[PDB]
Amino acid sequence: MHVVYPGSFDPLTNGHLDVIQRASRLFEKVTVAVLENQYLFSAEERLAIIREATAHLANVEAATFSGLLVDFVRRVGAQAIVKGLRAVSDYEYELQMAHLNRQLYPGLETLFILAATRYSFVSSTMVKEIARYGGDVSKLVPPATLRALKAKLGQ
Amino acid sequence: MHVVYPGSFDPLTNGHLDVIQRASRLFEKVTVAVLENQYLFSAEERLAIIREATAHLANVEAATFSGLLVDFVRRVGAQAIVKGLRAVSDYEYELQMAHLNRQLYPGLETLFILAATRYSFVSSTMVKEIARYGGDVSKLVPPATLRALKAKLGQ
Amino acid sequence: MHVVYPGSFDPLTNGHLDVIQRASRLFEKVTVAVLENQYLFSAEERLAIIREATAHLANVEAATFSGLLVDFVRRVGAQAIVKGLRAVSDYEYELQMAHLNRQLYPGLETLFILAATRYSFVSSTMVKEIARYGGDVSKLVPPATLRALKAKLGQ
Amino acid sequence: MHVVYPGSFDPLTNGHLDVIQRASRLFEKVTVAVLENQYLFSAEERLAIIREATAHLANVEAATFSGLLVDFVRRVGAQAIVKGLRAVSDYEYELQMAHLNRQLYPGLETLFILAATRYSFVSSTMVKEIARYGGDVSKLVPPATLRALKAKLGQ
Amino acid sequence: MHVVYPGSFDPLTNGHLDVIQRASRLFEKVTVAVLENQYLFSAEERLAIIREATAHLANVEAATFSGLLVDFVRRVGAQAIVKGLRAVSDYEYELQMAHLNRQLYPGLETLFILAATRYSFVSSTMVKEIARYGGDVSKLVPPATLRALKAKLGQ
Amino acid sequence: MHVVYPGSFDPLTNGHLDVIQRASRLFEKVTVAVLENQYLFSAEERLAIIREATAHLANVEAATFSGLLVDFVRRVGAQAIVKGLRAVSDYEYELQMAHLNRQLYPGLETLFILAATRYSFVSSTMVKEIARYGGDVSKLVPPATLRALKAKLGQ
Ligand SMILES: CC(C)(COP(=O)(O)O)[C@@H](O)C(=O)NCCC(=O)NCCS
Ligand SMILES: CC(C)(COP(=O)(O)O)[C@@H](O)C(=O)NCCC(=O)NCCS
Ligand SMILES: CC(C)(COP(=O)(O)O)[C@@H](O)C(=O)NCCC(=O)NCCS
Ligand SMILES: CC(C)(COP(=O)(O)O)[C@@H](O)C(=O)NCCC(=O)NCCS
Ligand SMILES: CC(C)(COP(=O)(O)O)[C@@H](O)C(=O)NCCC(=O)NCCS
Numbered sequence: 001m002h003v004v005y006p007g008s009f010d011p012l013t014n015g016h017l018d019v020i021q022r023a024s025r026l027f028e029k030v031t032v033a034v035l036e037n038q039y040l041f042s043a044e045e046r047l048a049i050i051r052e053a054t055a056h057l058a059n060v061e062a063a064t065f066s067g068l069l070v071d072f073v074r075r076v077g078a079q080a081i082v083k084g085l086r087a088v089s090d091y092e093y094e095l096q097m098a099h100l101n102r103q104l105y106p107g108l109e110t111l112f113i114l115a116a117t118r119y120s121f122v123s124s125t126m127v128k129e130i131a132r133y134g135g136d137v138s139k140l141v142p143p144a145t146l147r148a149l150k151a152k153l154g155q
Numbered sequence: 156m157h158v159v160y161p162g163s164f165d166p167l168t169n170g171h172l173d174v175i176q177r178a179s180r181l182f183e184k185v186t187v188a189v190l191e192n193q194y195l196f197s198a199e200e201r202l203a204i205i206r207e208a209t210a211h212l213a214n215v216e217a218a219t220f221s222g223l224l225v226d227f228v229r230r231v232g233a234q235a236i237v238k239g240l241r242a243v244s245d246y247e248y249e250l251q252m253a254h255l256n257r258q259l260y261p262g263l264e265t266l267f268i269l270a271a272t273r274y275s276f277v278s279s280t281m282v283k284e285i286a287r288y289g290g291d292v293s294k295l296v297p298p299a300t301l302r303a304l305k306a307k308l309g310q
Numbered sequence: 311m312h313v314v315y316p317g318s319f320d321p322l323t324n325g326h327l328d329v330i331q332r333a334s335r336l337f338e339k340v341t342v343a344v345l346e347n348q349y350l351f352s353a354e355e356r357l358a359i360i361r362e363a364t365a366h367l368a369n370v371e372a373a374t375f376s377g378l379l380v381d382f383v384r385r386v387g388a389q390a391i392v393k394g395l396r397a398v399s400d401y402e403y404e405l406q407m408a409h410l411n412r413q414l415y416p417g418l419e420t421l422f423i424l425a426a427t428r429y430s431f432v433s434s435t436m437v438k439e440i441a442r443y444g445g446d447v448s449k450l451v452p453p454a455t456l457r458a459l460k461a462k463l464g465q
Numbered sequence: 466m467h468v469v470y471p472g473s474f475d476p477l478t479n480g481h482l483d484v485i486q487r488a489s490r491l492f493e494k495v496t497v498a499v500l501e502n503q504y505l506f507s508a509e510e511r512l513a514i515i516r517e518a519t520a521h522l523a524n525v526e527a528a529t530f531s532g533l534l535v536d537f538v539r540r541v542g543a544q545a546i547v548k549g550l551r552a553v554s555d556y557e558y559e560l561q562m563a564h565l566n567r568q569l570y571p572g573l574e575t576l577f578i579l580a581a582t583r584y585s586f587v588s589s590t591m592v593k594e595i596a597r598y599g600g601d602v603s604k605l606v607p608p609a610t611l612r613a614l615k616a617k618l619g620q
Numbered sequence: 621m622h623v624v625y626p627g628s629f630d631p632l633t634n635g636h637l638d639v640i641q642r643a644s645r646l647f648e649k650v651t652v653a654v655l656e657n658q659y660l661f662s663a664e665e666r667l668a669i670i671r672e673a674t675a676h677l678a679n680v681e682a683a684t685f686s687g688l689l690v691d692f693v694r695r696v697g698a699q700a701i702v703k704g705l706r707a708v709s710d711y712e713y714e715l716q717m718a719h720l721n722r723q724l725y726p727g728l729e730t731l732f733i734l735a736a737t738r739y740s741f742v743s744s745t746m747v748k749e750i751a752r753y754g755g756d757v758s759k760l761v762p763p764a765t766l767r768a769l770k771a772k773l774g775q
Numbered sequence: 776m777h778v779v780y781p782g783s784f785d786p787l788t789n790g791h792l793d794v795i796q797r798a799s800r801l802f803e804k805v806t807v808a809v810l811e812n813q814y815l816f817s818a819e820e821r822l823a824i825i826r827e828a829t830a831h832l833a834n835v836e837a838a839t840f841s842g843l844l845v846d847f848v849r850r851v852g853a854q855a856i857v858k859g860l861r862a863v864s865d866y867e868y869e870l871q872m873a874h875l876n877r878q879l880y881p882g883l884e885t886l887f888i889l890a891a892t893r894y895s896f897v898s899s900t901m902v903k904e905i906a907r908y909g910g911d912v913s914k915l916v917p918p919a920t921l922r923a924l925k926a927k928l929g930q
């Protein structure tokens with residue numbers, strides 16, 4: 001089974017990486033789909049961070065996409081969408097998108113994986129807010145992201 | 156009983172229409188109140204969509220309003236506000252507005268109606284996002300809205 | 311419009327009474343349906359409490375019922391079910407019953423009314439627990455209920 | 466991938482069957498695990514209902530189990546647990562079990578699938594309550610379950 | 621114990637004041653931290669409102685801050701953060717910040733206090749929206765805020 | 776400040792202990808109140824587990840109580856109730872009790888502390904269920920509890 005893990009990943013956090021690692025162990029192939037269209041990092045920068053952070057996972061690929069997610073899924077020939085859930089995640093929103101995507105692409109399923117408990121409260125938005133003020137986010141994001149934040153924010 | 160169903164309806168979805176149809180069957184009179192003040196459709200366009208989509212309901216009228224909803228309710232002489240609820244709807248926000256409106260207009264009640272299960276995950280925001288990228292939203296919105304989206308987005 | 315407000319009301323609390331009073335002001339007729347089948351009070355005792363507590367509302371009647379609520383609704387010729395909502399109420403459960411009842415009795419709607427903010431945290435279960443240990447529940451329940459609790463618990 | 470779908474299924478509803486059908490299409494093998502230990506139906510009766518209702522799915526097997534679910538998963542050599550989610554489901558409880566099971570069986574993942582919107586409000590408990598009073602549950606459960614309910618309740 | 625109650629307080633509502641009053645009675649010292657960085661009121665105006673509204677509480681001080689809240693907490697030598705909770709409050713968001721702050725400032729706890737039931741549905745955003753259209757918010761905010769709103773909105 | 780941490784603690788889990796440890800560091804005195812009245816462990820056994828597990832905390836005492844919690848609080852002369860919150864905890868129920876207790880004991884506050892993220896999904900009920908079937912709960916409960924479970928369940 002080939003699954004697609006979509007998101008803006010601005011930037012990639014340990015929560016995202018944890019879900020990617022779990023999907024990597026479960027499925028034959030995982031494609032991380034990076035949304036491209038105000039993000040802190042460009043689509044290219046976000047993709048580069050992901051390629052560096054997932055280099056150790058042999059069955060994980062990554063690419064940017066524009067337009068409808070279901071069209072990307074069809075384009076890469078995947079069987080399902082995978083998303084991570086956190087005790088904090090917007091349950092309603094994920095359910096809504098999952099149902100809508102299953103209508104746009106008749107029968108396309110979204111499978112939810114539970115992110116590691118230790119990263120239950122990590123979000124890209126909070127990482128950026130903390131980093132912006134010089135806060136230490138080293139335990140919340142992978143090394144590739146930490147380096148990118150320091151370069152971007154000039155810290 | 157005369158009830159008012161308020162909203163921005165940008166644009167009207169099948170979820171909204173379903174609630175309007177239920178209110179039409181329950182109450183003697185229903186007035187759909189269209190908020191006017193960045194919306195995709197102008198207040199006039201949103202009102203026109205509603206008039207076309209509800210033409211089959213003899214006791215349903217529609218009008219735009221600015222300012223406080225409670226002042227519009229008093230203006231048209233309605234007895235209550237009616238709102239639709241979805242297993243996804245922002246329960247907290249609706250409860251908050253209902254309580255505040257009951258204070259602004261002493262004793263003015265808001266009655267909640269459950270939208271059809273089949274439209275539980277439809278929202279104007281998602282309809283616009285999907286339509287913007289050429290996605291098929293024909294099963295999510297009434298014909299009047301579908302026509303308006305194609306003309307607006309030039310599709 | 312004739313509406314039915316169902317419940318076990320074991321015993322009737324100020325939250326229940328508040329909703330009954332709001333329904334009384336909104337609708338032409340309100341019938342409080344008392345479920346009869348381990349309750350602290352018998353169906354007869356629960357009905358008596360309700361008749362005493364709602365005596366001041368001219369358009370409110372009360373009766374016990376067994377079996378399906380929808381059959382009682384049809385029996386008394388009501389147009390809808392009314393239920394109260396609290397920021398604490400089991401939103402999911404009420405939504406579930408509302409949808410199921412709308413299927414059992416094709417098109418039968420349930421209208422939700424918001425209970426007074428001051429009684430947002432009152433429930434029959436907590437009233438009984440507090441009263442059982444001699445706690446003062448006088449501000450949480452109507453006089454009829456207070457008298458019944460003192461007699462039942464021998465306080 | 467071989468997945469296990471656990472539950473008490475007392476009795477199997479259309480919500481359960483829908484999830485089983487989705488899992489059947491996604492995974493190579495699906496084993497429905499029936500909990501055996503006050504249920505309305507015996508473990509044998511519940512298993513029989515499932516075997517009849519899933520007969521059309523070639524890659525779906527079913528069996529009863531006692532003790533820890535993770536031990537059953539290991540016993541049948543499955544790679545993950547699959548559970549269905551409904552906009553009403555006890556999100557917290559499912560998350561809790563998923564995390565605990567991932568600890569008991571190091572790394573064992575639970576994948577969540579979204580049940581069909583039309584069965585979002587169906588639960589075994591409500592089916593039994595409605596059927597007990599002669600209510601029509603034919604649209605809420607599969608034929609095998611309908612027959613079992615009529616025989617059990619003598620209707 | 622010295623606690624810090626942070627927020628934007630744009631403007632201070634009765635919900636905020638209620639929590640401040642409760643914290644004042646519980647702890648030896650309370651410092652209200654006003655976030656400074658599009659707010660309706662300037663940081664100076666927001667601080668002035670708070671100083672006027674809390675003048676009756678002898679152990680309550682107030683100051684503006686920029687950057688990380690944890691740095692302000694350390695700066696004033698406080699032992700914990702205190703936040704108010706409402707049956708409507710974004711539980712998830714408060715939990716997220718509490719956990720993140722406990723990581724940034726190793727072991728720094730956030731203590732949650734329940735706001736008065738009567739102000740359970742009051743928020744700065746809704747106060748501003750209502751006041752903007754000439755609605756009466758006198759029962760939702762303290763006198764200092766009412767005066768500031770009339771001057772700011774020229775009402 | 777002297778605070779009371781109430782519960783049935785049947786048995787004490789790492790989630791409970793974590794909250795007790797946090798309260799111990801924050802407040803001058805902490806009294807763990809053990810509810811006594813079908814529990815797996817007797818009130819005496821539950822209290823013994825707590826005394827052993829909290830022996831390292833010099834300002835923590837423990838005692839059993841019957842009747843109303845507010846009466847126990849008054850009896851020991853405490854200033855507030857402290858409770859732990861988990862992203863899974865029944866938010867509504869805790870809010871309800873906090874409000875009711877603040878009415879029974881005019882002004883008695885309940886302060887909520889966030890349990891460690893790592894124990895976010897641990898509950899006494901699940902510990903007992905897992906232990907009953909021979910599951911390893913050593914990482915979910917303190918040594919005192921592990922020993923008590925083995926003796927009670929004869930494992
Ligand atoms: C990128 C994402 C998966 C959400 O990512 P996020 O959780 O990082 O904000 C979603 O916005 C998306 O799928 N966008 C592509 C447009 C689309 O397909 N929209 C219809 C969704 S039903
Ligand atoms: C239009 C609406 C009903 C919300 O509509 P929405 O759900 O489509 O966003 C609400 O914004 C409104 O009532 N606006 C008028 C201003 C007002 O009365 N505000 C006070 C609300 S308590
Ligand atoms: C009595 C009540 C309204 C719930 O009352 P409660 O909130 O006081 O517990 C509900 O149990 C009911 O309607 N019972 C009658 C049986 C029935 O119709 N069941 C199907 C519900 S979909
Ligand atoms: C049967 C079920 C999946 C829950 O089923 P339900 O949703 O039908 O009530 C759960 O109770 C279970 O896994 N029971 C076996 C005992 C066990 O493994 N318990 C630990 C759960 S973390
Ligand atoms: C001001 C506030 C407490 C939130 O206030 P609000 O609820 O009024 O919007 C929060 O934004 C904050 O602490 N800001 C300072 C920046 C910071 O410390 N961010 C990290 C939060 S984990």
Ligand SMILES: CC(C)(COP(=O)(O)O)[C@@H](O)C(=O)NCCC(=O)NCCS
Nearest residue numbers: 781782783784810842843844872875876
């Ligand atoms: C023991 C407890 C704190 C709840 O404990 P739990 O979360 O372990 O189930 C609660 O049941 C309690 O306070 N019981 C004493 C009786 C009482 O005071 N009841 C009124 C509560 S408002």
